[PDB]
């Protein structure tokens, strides 16, 4: 009933996964990950790459595939009671996105930043590149899409549309690449906020302000 700790999954699923990763490189950063022309790189690090790309195409196809087919066909008449439950789960998807972005755009990014300072790169495929570019980014993009689709397929307001700011939010990362804009999130919240208040205007939200609160 209402909004569950299906959320606790969303927060810990990345946290555990990425903390395992940080350990994993932590031990093989030095050992294998220094000289790329050693055969221990083609096993502990290169194989890691091929594994993830494949896992990402797959889970992406499954995750988007799933939701697009379980798209609510008879959306026209379903209760405000669930138009809330769903709105909340949507918000969990966004928490999952934001968390996923944190790891990608802040964590592993400025980490790669440090890595460059300490060893001259042997490949465009350093450990922190295998993790920063081809693990971290696909993940938050997949999370991104998921959320978008969930909203489009699960909530009116979002269905019959394609939100601009939301589209921009989700595909934006596809036009972010280095050497040698994600604020859309606002627009898309101010939306999800309205989405919450269709029946849930009441209020509070204008009634129980003019009184207690």
């Amino acid at each position: 009933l209402l909004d569950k700790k299906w959320l606790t999954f969303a927060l810990a699923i990345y946290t555990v996964f990425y903390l395992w990763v940080r350990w994993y490189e932590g031990v093989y950063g030095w050992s294998a990950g220094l000289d790329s022309f050693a055969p221990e790189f083609e096993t502990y690090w290169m194989n890691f790459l091929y594994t993830e790309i494949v896992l990402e195409i797959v889970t992406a196809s499954i995750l988007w595939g799933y939701l697009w087919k379980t798209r609510d066909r008879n959306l026209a008449a379903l209760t405000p009671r669930e138009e809330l439950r769903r709105n909340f789960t949507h918000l969990v998807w966004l928490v999952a996105y934001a968390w996923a972005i944190y790891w990608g755009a802040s964590y592993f990014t400025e980490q790669d930043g440090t890595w460059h300072q300490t060893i001259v790169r042997d490949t465009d495929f350093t450990p922190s590149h295998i993790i920063e570019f081809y693990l971290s980014y696909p993940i938050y993009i997949i999370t991104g899409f998921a959320a978008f689709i969930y909203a489009k397929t699960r909530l009116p307001f979002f269905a019959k549309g394609i939100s601009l700011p939301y589209l921009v939010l989700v595909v934006g990362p596809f036009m972010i690449l280095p050497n040698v804009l994600a604020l859309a999130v606002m627009g898309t919240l101010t939306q999800t906020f309205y989405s919450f208040a269709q029946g849930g205007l009441g209020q509070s939200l204008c009634e129980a302000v003019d009184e207690g609160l």
Partner: protein, 382 residues
């Protein structure tokens, strides 16, 4: 680490490192290891690498597993960038203090201005001990002696926490109240402005005045302690003293030079011609950190990295003494796995198939002549 992947001809024709020496192979935390040697900036510097007008004498390691206590090109201490001059040879000396226990492949590298870290040979050095043992003491012109490992650490932290807290304090103050969906709607139908009012706007200027106040107080408080301070010292050192080399007594001429694809060896047809007066023999060809020796003629003692030293890698069709006044053409082959391991064989992907090295000749009583060769190097497949 990081050579190997970089263009084979860049590595051949950029900086030649020789007479390298390392004072120790194994060292305790806080102990010193001293790297010495010479480097020549190759006269035929490639295009495409900005001339070393502003270069920096760096060290090739995985971070501060050592700290660089001192570095010297010519006689002079070199903490800045320095202007090196094409064609010239210099002697350098790096002095490293050990900081992190482990096995490090330390290189001596040049950092050049416009495109390129120019990485010299790397040698494995082992640090034993505990990082908790490391000290980096330094005495100021101000009286005090501090440890650079931790100096000013607590200060840094305080000021960041303090300000960070105040940032939180501000959002905190506003977030006692509800944040989004009521405040959003209030703005919508009808006016906002019930959402904020002094005592809100008193706190607003409380913060605003408090902030300017604390900044200026803090600053001239930081000026009270620490009244003697300089700006970051910077700026390229010119006038690097180059090494005065005697004109070489041998001259060589490279007629064709080929390599097998795929292979582990480079052949070249040299006309060695011995001016000056003592029977001379060829003992080494140095090419891209990789050193090929005729062990019938010369033997490394400096403990040059084992993966880069080809003990009898170099074979001369005729390496009998070359009498003074005499001049002969000879077929020379530099051969060793290092040619494939360090990817000099990757010259076949380079847009400029030209090599460059140093040959080392030795007379009877064992004093040496260094001539430098460069030429186009041509593949042969069939």
């Amino acid at each position: 680490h990081g050579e190997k992947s970089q263009a084979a001809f860049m590595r051949m024709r950029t900086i030649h490192w020789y007479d390298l020496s390392w004072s120790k192979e194994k060292v305790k935390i806080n102990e010193t290891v001293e790297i010495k040697g010479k480097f020549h900036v190759f006269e035929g510097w490639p295009e495409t690498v900005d001339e070393p007008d502003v270069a920096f004498l760096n060290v090739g390691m995985p971070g501060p597993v050592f700290i660089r206590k001192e570095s010297y090109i010519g006689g002079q201490l070199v903490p800045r960038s320095v202007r090196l001059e094409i064609g010239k040879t210099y002697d350098f000396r790096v002095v490293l203090k050990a900081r992190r226990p482990g096995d490090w492949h330390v290189h001596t590298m040049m950092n050049v201005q416009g495109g390129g870290p120019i990485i010299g040979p790397g040698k494995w050095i082992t640090v034993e001990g505990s990082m908790s043992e490391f000290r980096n003491p330094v005495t100021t012109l101000t009286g005090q002696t501090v440890d650079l490992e931790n100096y000013n650490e607590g200060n840094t932290y305080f000021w960041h926490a303090f300000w960070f807290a105040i940032g939180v304090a501000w959002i905190g103050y506003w977030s006692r109240r509800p944040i989004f969906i009521p405040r959003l709607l209030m703005v919508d139908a009808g006016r906002a402005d019930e959402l904020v009012s002094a005592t809100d706007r008193k706190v607003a200027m409380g913060f605003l005045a408090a902030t300017i106040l604390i900044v200026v107080m803090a600053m001239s408080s930081a000026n009270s302690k620490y009244p003697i301070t300089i700006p970051l010292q910077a700026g390229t050192m010119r006038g690097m003293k180059p090494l005065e080399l005697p004109a070489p007594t041998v001259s060589v001429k490279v007629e064709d030079a080929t390599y097998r694809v795929p292979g582990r060896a480079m052949r070249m047809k040299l006309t060695i011609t011995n001016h000056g007066n003592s029977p001379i023999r060829l003992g080494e060809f140095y090419t891209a950190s990789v050193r090929f020796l005729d062990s019938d003629v010369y033997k490394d003692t400096t403990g040059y990295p084992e993966d880069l030293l080809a003990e009898d890698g170099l074979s001369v069709s005729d390496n009998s003494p070359l009498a003074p006044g005499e001049t002969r053409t000879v077929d020379v082959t530099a051969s060793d796995a290092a040619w494939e391991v360090y990817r000099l064989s990757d010259i076949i992907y380079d847009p400029d198939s030209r090599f460059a090295g140093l040959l080392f000749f030795f007379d009877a009583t064992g004093n040496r002549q260094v001539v430098q060769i460069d030429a186009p190097l041509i593949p042969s497949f069939m």
